[PDB]
PDB file of C-alpha atoms in Angstrom:
ATOM      1  CA  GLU A1793    -290.569 -65.014 -19.291  1.00 13.89           C
ATOM      2  CA  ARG A1794    -292.554 -66.961 -16.685  1.00 13.84           C
ATOM      3  CA  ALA A1795    -295.729 -65.666 -18.350  1.00 12.75           C
ATOM      4  CA  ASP A1796    -294.401 -67.318 -21.551  1.00  8.04           C
ATOM      5  CA  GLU A1797    -295.550 -64.568 -23.931  1.00  9.22           C
ATOM      6  CA  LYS A1798    -293.017 -63.752 -26.661  1.00 12.53           C
ATOM      7  CA  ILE A1799    -295.601 -61.787 -28.681  1.00 15.27           C
ATOM      8  CA  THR A1800    -294.006 -58.491 -27.627  1.00 16.25           C
ATOM      9  CA  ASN A1801    -291.590 -56.694 -29.934  1.00 13.44           C
ATOM     10  CA  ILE A1802    -289.096 -56.548 -27.044  1.00 14.92           C
ATOM     11  CA  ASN A1803    -286.984 -59.687 -26.721  1.00 13.33           C
ATOM     12  CA  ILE A1804    -286.495 -61.307 -23.313  1.00 17.42           C
ATOM     13  CA  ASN A1805    -284.272 -64.346 -23.964  1.00 21.12           C
ATOM     14  CA  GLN A1806    -281.061 -62.300 -24.290  1.00 22.96           C
ATOM     15  CA  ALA A1807    -281.237 -59.479 -21.720  1.00 23.13           C
ATOM     16  CA  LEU A1808    -280.227 -61.669 -18.760  1.00 24.68           C
ATOM     17  CA  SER A1809    -276.634 -61.905 -20.000  1.00 21.76           C
ATOM     18  CA  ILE A1810    -276.603 -58.176 -20.802  1.00 21.05           C
ATOM     19  CA  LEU A1811    -277.588 -57.329 -17.223  1.00 21.30           C
ATOM     20  CA  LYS A1812    -274.845 -59.572 -15.811  1.00 20.99           C
ATOM     21  CA  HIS A1813    -272.246 -58.054 -18.148  1.00 20.61           C
ATOM     22  CA  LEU A1814    -273.330 -54.524 -17.211  1.00 16.21           C
ATOM     23  CA  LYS A1815    -273.121 -55.371 -13.501  1.00 19.73           C
ATOM     24  CA  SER A1816    -269.653 -56.882 -13.970  1.00 19.66           C
ATOM     25  CA  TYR A1817    -268.498 -53.745 -15.820  1.00 18.10           C
ATOM     26  CA  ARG A1818    -267.803 -50.339 -14.272  1.00 17.55           C
ATOM     27  CA  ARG A1819    -268.127 -47.111 -16.246  1.00 18.33           C
ATOM     28  CA  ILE A1820    -265.045 -44.882 -16.341  1.00 20.82           C
ATOM     29  CA  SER A1821    -266.556 -41.743 -17.916  1.00 20.87           C
ATOM     30  CA  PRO A1822    -269.238 -39.230 -16.877  1.00 22.29           C
ATOM     31  CA  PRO A1823    -272.674 -39.590 -18.498  1.00 23.61           C
ATOM     32  CA  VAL A1824    -272.900 -38.305 -22.065  1.00 22.82           C
ATOM     33  CA  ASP A1825    -275.449 -35.716 -23.197  1.00 21.25           C
ATOM     34  CA  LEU A1826    -277.429 -38.439 -24.990  1.00 21.78           C
ATOM     35  CA  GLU A1827    -278.348 -40.058 -21.665  1.00 23.34           C
ATOM     36  CA  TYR A1828    -279.315 -36.661 -20.228  1.00 22.00           C
ATOM     37  CA  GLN A1829    -281.506 -35.935 -23.263  1.00 21.37           C
ATOM     38  CA  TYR A1830    -283.217 -39.334 -23.126  1.00 20.02           C
ATOM     39  CA  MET A1831    -283.804 -38.989 -19.378  1.00 17.07           C
ATOM     40  CA  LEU A1832    -285.206 -35.461 -19.784  1.00 18.37           C
ATOM     41  CA  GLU A1833    -287.660 -36.690 -22.427  1.00 14.07           C
ATOM     42  CA  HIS A1834    -289.195 -38.822 -19.628  1.00 17.28           C
ATOM     43  CA  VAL A1835    -288.171 -36.443 -16.868  1.00 17.14           C
ATOM     44  CA  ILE A1836    -286.708 -38.207 -13.813  1.00 16.53           C
ATOM     45  CA  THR A1837    -283.736 -37.181 -11.677  1.00 16.00           C
ATOM     46  CA  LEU A1838    -280.609 -39.102 -12.653  1.00 18.57           C
ATOM     47  CA  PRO A1839    -279.405 -41.408  -9.846  1.00 21.45           C
ATOM     48  CA  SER A1840    -275.804 -41.770  -8.703  1.00 22.83           C
ATOM     49  CA  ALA A1841    -275.487 -45.088 -10.579  1.00 22.15           C
ATOM     50  CA  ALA A1842    -275.022 -43.067 -13.781  1.00 22.27           C
ATOM     51  CA  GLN A1843    -271.488 -42.414 -12.519  1.00 20.89           C
ATOM     52  CA  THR A1844    -270.683 -46.148 -12.379  1.00 22.05           C
ATOM     53  CA  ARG A1845    -272.776 -47.976 -15.000  1.00 19.82           C
ATOM     54  CA  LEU A1846    -274.434 -47.609 -18.410  1.00 19.29           C
ATOM     55  CA  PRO A1847    -278.160 -47.068 -19.093  1.00 19.01           C
ATOM     56  CA  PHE A1848    -280.021 -50.216 -20.101  1.00 19.68           C
ATOM     57  CA  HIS A1849    -282.877 -48.445 -21.910  1.00 23.26           C
ATOM     58  CA  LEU A1850    -280.560 -46.843 -24.480  1.00 22.70           C
ATOM     59  CA  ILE A1851    -278.650 -50.108 -25.035  1.00 22.68           C
ATOM     60  CA  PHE A1852    -281.175 -52.920 -25.437  1.00 18.37           C
ATOM     61  CA  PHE A1853    -284.065 -51.421 -27.424  1.00 20.35           C
ATOM     62  CA  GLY A1854    -282.180 -48.274 -28.424  1.00 22.19           C
ATOM     63  CA  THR A1855    -280.772 -47.666 -31.871  1.00 26.90           C
ATOM     64  CA  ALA A1856    -277.264 -48.666 -32.915  1.00 26.32           C
ATOM     65  CA  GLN A1857    -276.575 -44.950 -33.398  1.00 23.60           C
ATOM     66  CA  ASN A1858    -277.163 -44.484 -29.666  1.00 22.70           C
ATOM     67  CA  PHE A1859    -275.020 -47.576 -29.051  1.00 20.39           C
ATOM     68  CA  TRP A1860    -272.034 -46.049 -30.873  1.00 19.93           C
ATOM     69  CA  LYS A1861    -272.671 -42.616 -29.346  1.00 20.97           C
ATOM     70  CA  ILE A1862    -272.535 -44.137 -25.853  1.00 15.36           C
ATOM     71  CA  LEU A1863    -269.650 -46.598 -26.272  1.00 16.08           C
ATOM     72  CA  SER A1864    -267.541 -43.967 -28.075  1.00 13.84           C
ATOM     73  CA  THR A1865    -266.448 -42.391 -24.776  1.00 13.49           C
ATOM     74  CA  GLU A1866    -266.025 -45.781 -23.047  1.00 16.87           C
ATOM     75  CA  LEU A1867    -263.314 -47.186 -25.336  1.00 18.51           C
ATOM     76  CA  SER A1868    -260.200 -48.548 -23.620  1.00 15.96           C
ATOM     77  CA  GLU A1869    -257.943 -51.598 -23.753  1.00 17.06           C
ATOM     78  CA  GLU A1870    -259.532 -53.159 -20.658  1.00 17.30           C
ATOM     79  CA  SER A1871    -263.058 -52.282 -21.811  1.00 19.41           C
ATOM     80  CA  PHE A1872    -262.437 -53.688 -25.297  1.00 20.70           C
ATOM     81  CA  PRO A1873    -263.197 -57.366 -24.450  1.00 20.92           C
ATOM     82  CA  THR A1874    -266.354 -56.534 -22.472  1.00 15.22           C
ATOM     83  CA  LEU A1875    -267.704 -54.121 -25.090  1.00 14.84           C
ATOM     84  CA  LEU A1876    -266.766 -56.533 -27.894  1.00 15.23           C
ATOM     85  CA  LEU A1877    -268.709 -59.315 -26.166  1.00 16.04           C
ATOM     86  CA  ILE A1878    -271.653 -56.941 -25.661  1.00 15.88           C
ATOM     87  CA  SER A1879    -271.603 -56.048 -29.364  1.00 16.24           C
ATOM     88  CA  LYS A1880    -271.460 -59.772 -30.150  1.00 11.39           C
ATOM     89  CA  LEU A1881    -274.629 -60.158 -28.082  1.00 11.32           C
ATOM     90  CA  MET A1882    -276.053 -57.009 -29.714  1.00  9.31           C
ATOM     91  CA  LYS A1883    -275.555 -58.511 -33.208  1.00  9.39           C
ATOM     92  CA  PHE A1884    -274.306 -55.087 -34.321  1.00  8.85           C
ATOM     93  CA  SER A1885    -271.545 -54.145 -36.761  1.00  9.06           C
ATOM     94  CA  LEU A1886    -268.292 -55.195 -35.096  1.00  6.46           C
ATOM     95  CA  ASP A1887    -266.227 -53.396 -37.759  1.00  5.33           C
ATOM     96  CA  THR A1888    -267.165 -49.940 -36.453  1.00  7.88           C
ATOM     97  CA  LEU A1889    -266.048 -51.006 -32.974  1.00  4.91           C
ATOM     98  CA  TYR A1890    -262.776 -52.355 -34.373  1.00  4.92           C
ATOM     99  CA  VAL A1891    -262.042 -49.145 -36.301  1.00  2.42           C
ATOM    100  CA  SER A1892    -262.895 -46.945 -33.312  1.00  2.29           C
ATOM    101  CA  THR A1893    -260.806 -49.076 -30.938  1.00  2.01           C
ATOM    102  CA  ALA A1894    -257.832 -49.041 -33.311  1.00  6.07           C
ATOM    103  CA  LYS A1895    -257.991 -45.250 -33.630  1.00  7.53           C
ATOM    104  CA  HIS A1896    -258.410 -44.823 -29.860  1.00  6.54           C
ATOM    105  CA  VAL A1897    -255.461 -47.094 -29.043  1.00  5.46           C
ATOM    106  CA  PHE A1898    -253.299 -45.349 -31.653  1.00  5.81           C
ATOM    107  CA  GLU A1899    -254.161 -41.906 -30.271  1.00  2.16           C
ATOM    108  CA  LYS A1900    -254.031 -42.657 -26.535  1.00  4.38           C
ATOM    109  CA  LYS A1901    -251.357 -45.367 -26.278  1.00  5.16           C
ATOM    110  CA  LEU A1902    -249.248 -45.500 -29.453  1.00  4.59           C
ATOM    111  CA  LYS A1903    -249.005 -41.766 -30.198  1.00  3.51           C
ATOM    112  CA  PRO A1904    -247.215 -40.680 -26.965  1.00  8.06           C
TER     113      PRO A1904
END
């Protein structure tokens, strides 16, 4: 950003809020096989931070399919506002998140 070169296909003006939101959020689930596969394509040992946070490479410039594969296992009532705000900043389809959250809350909280 200091270099002032927005010619790259990767955006820079929006990732600062994403990093803060990811730092403020704590992951509750073990890493999914998608993260293992993406890390083993560019082989590097997974650090311990995979147990507490979400990978930035698969979120920012990754596909929305990866987005919904990763946030599928992270759905909860407390995580719903943070993930909804992230999806607002992702400019993705909020309706899929709403349907998935409704089904998850029905199954985990309303069913018992």
